[PDB]
Amino acid sequence: AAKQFARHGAASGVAAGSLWPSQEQLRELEAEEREWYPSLAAMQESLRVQQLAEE
Protein backbone atom coordinates (compact mmCIF):
# COMPACT_ATOMS: atom_id res chain seq x y z
CA ALA A 1 0.00 0.00 0.00
CA ALA A 2 2.84 2.41 0.80
CA LYS A 3 4.51 1.59 -2.52
CA GLN A 4 1.32 2.47 -4.40
CA PHE A 5 1.24 5.86 -2.66
CA ALA A 6 4.84 6.54 -3.71
CA ARG A 7 3.94 5.45 -7.25
CA HIS A 8 0.69 7.40 -7.69
CA GLY A 9 -0.51 8.76 -4.34
CA ALA A 10 -3.35 10.89 -5.68
CA ALA A 11 -4.87 7.97 -7.59
CA SER A 12 -3.80 5.34 -5.03
CA GLY A 13 -6.72 6.18 -2.74
CA VAL A 14 -4.87 5.51 0.53
CA ALA A 15 -4.76 7.86 3.50
CA ALA A 16 -1.38 9.53 3.93
CA GLY A 17 -1.59 8.98 7.70
CA SER A 18 -0.91 5.26 7.33
CA LEU A 19 2.68 6.00 6.25
CA TRP A 20 3.73 7.03 9.75
CA PRO A 21 4.12 4.58 12.64
CA SER A 22 1.13 4.25 14.93
CA GLN A 23 1.21 5.07 18.64
CA GLU A 24 1.68 1.38 19.45
CA GLN A 25 4.45 1.19 16.85
CA LEU A 26 6.02 4.50 17.90
CA ARG A 27 6.41 3.31 21.49
CA GLU A 28 8.06 0.15 20.16
CA LEU A 29 10.40 2.22 17.99
CA GLU A 30 11.17 4.57 20.88
CA ALA A 31 12.20 1.77 23.24
CA GLU A 32 14.24 -0.25 20.74
CA GLU A 33 16.41 2.66 19.60
CA ARG A 34 16.90 3.92 23.17
CA GLU A 35 18.02 0.60 24.66
CA TRP A 36 20.33 -0.43 21.80
CA TYR A 37 21.68 2.89 20.50
CA PRO A 38 23.19 4.88 23.40
CA SER A 39 23.46 8.67 23.66
CA LEU A 40 26.38 10.86 22.65
CA ALA A 41 26.95 11.82 26.28
CA ALA A 42 27.04 8.15 27.30
CA MET A 43 29.47 7.30 24.50
CA GLN A 44 31.75 10.24 25.34
CA GLU A 45 31.86 9.41 29.05
CA SER A 46 32.30 5.67 28.40
CA LEU A 47 35.46 6.32 26.38
CA ARG A 48 36.84 8.59 29.11
CA VAL A 49 36.55 5.77 31.67
CA GLN A 50 38.47 3.35 29.44
CA GLN A 51 41.12 5.96 28.59
CA LEU A 52 41.63 6.70 32.29
CA ALA A 53 41.68 2.99 33.16
CA GLU A 54 44.28 2.04 30.54
CA GLU A 55 46.50 5.04 31.32
Binding site: A1, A2, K3, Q4, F5, A6, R7, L19, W20, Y37, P38, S39, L40, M43, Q44, S46, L47
Partner: peptide
Protein backbone atom coordinates in the same frame (compact mmCIF):
# COMPACT_ATOMS: atom_id res chain seq x y z
CA UNK B 1 11.44 7.92 -2.31
CA UNK B 2 9.53 5.24 -4.24
CA UNK B 3 9.29 3.02 -1.14
CA UNK B 4 6.69 5.31 0.44
CA UNK B 5 8.42 5.61 3.81
CA UNK B 6 9.25 8.63 5.98
CA UNK B 7 12.85 9.83 5.98
CA UNK B 8 14.50 8.40 9.12
CA UNK B 9 16.96 10.03 11.48
CA UNK B 10 20.68 9.58 10.87
CA UNK B 11 22.19 7.38 13.57
CA UNK B 12 25.12 8.35 15.77
CA UNK B 13 28.61 6.91 15.20
CA UNK B 14 29.54 3.94 17.41
CA UNK B 15 31.85 4.31 20.39
CA UNK B 16 34.79 3.24 18.22
CA UNK B 17 34.35 6.13 15.76
CA UNK B 18 33.46 8.87 18.27
CA UNK B 19 37.02 10.31 18.64
Amino acid sequence: FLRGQPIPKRMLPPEALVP
